[PDB]
Design a protein around this ligand. Structure first.
Ligand code: NI
Ligand code: NI
Lengths: 191, 191
């Protein structure tokens, strides 16, 4: 499985996300600011669909920094017939976690869900090639996407991320505040 | 010649600089926020001196985005016995260009200068291994560095950069405002 990350930005990327991108050899498109995030997500879908080497479109909000991604567990869920695999981070709205059934979840679990906020979310090509386009419309384009297109959706507890508030302080998946203030290096020849 | 870029940041990097970093296969350390830029520059010097595979410490401010770098012209100047090679961008203070003799220069030229603002600046190891440490102290650590350590310093007109004001709008080296609002991609498999 080959994944292309699309990161909606406001024109910059915080260091902790740069570090994740470098350390994990991630392939991505960081989207410059547009009128609204829904417009960026539609652009992402358009670009993704043309880029046939990529099997999975991963949306990652610029303030969401994965702790670990078990890509084989994500791939396993798609193979089993899920359309969308959701990861967990705590919302900056303080309303709960980034996945929902009847409401934003209060606790992390592995299970089928109704949707998520599109901030840490893997979507398979097969599903996206079938959906009516344009696909994201803005409540948000997140509830719209799920309510309208009804993907078979699974939340993995093994997908966890920090949700950064500023460049250094983040909400951790254990609902604590953490601080990450390290430098970020891309060095190929420190022998 | 192998160059390690040190980029003092406030915890994020604007897209246009990410694009420069990716497109040009740059090796770097982006420095997280500290008390003051002088502290970041000293940390940079300490790290650089230990990393013996790197011949040149390049400082690049996070809001400075090179247009072109002729690395062979930089290397040529070091071979000729310069210690520091300075590039040009227009200051956001609007006072002139980033290099000075008696004052900030009003026009771009190839020639020996007294110093620059340390925002687009290549410094050779030989010089840095000789200087009294600690080396940067904050007027700024830029005038201090040059006034105190008196490197043999050359400004190359072939080193030009944009000086970004926000994430998209920049002062160009021709003293005009330009806008860069493209997405930034790192994609290895668009076949
Ligand atoms: Ni090497
Ligand atoms: Ni390939």
């Amino acid at each position: 499985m080959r994944t292309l990350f699309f990161i909606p930005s406001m024109g910059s990327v915080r260091l902790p996300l740069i570090d994740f991108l470098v350390k994990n050899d991630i392939e991505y498109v960081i989207l410059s600011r547009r009128n609204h995030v829904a417009v960026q997500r539609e652009i992402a879908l358009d670009m993704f669909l043309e880029m046939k080497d990529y099997d999975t479109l991963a949306f990652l909000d610029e303030d969401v920094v994965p702790i670990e991604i078990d890509f084989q567990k994500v791939e396993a869920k798609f193979n089993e017939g899920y359309d969308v695999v959701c990861g967990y981070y705590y919302l900056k709205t303080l309303r709960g976690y980034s996945v929902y059934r009847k409401d934003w979840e209060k606790e992390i679990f592995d299970g089928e869900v109704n949707g998520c906020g599109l901030g840490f979310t893997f979507i398979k090509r097969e599903f996206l090639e079938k959906i009516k386009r344009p696909a994201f419309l803005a409540i948000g384009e997140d509830v719209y996407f799920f309510s309208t297109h009804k993907p078979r959706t699974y939340a993995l507890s093994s997908l966890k991320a920090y949700h950064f508030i500023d460049e250094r302080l983040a909400l951790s998946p254990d609902r604590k505040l953490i601080l990450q203030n390290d430098h970020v290096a891309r060095i190929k020849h420190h022998h």
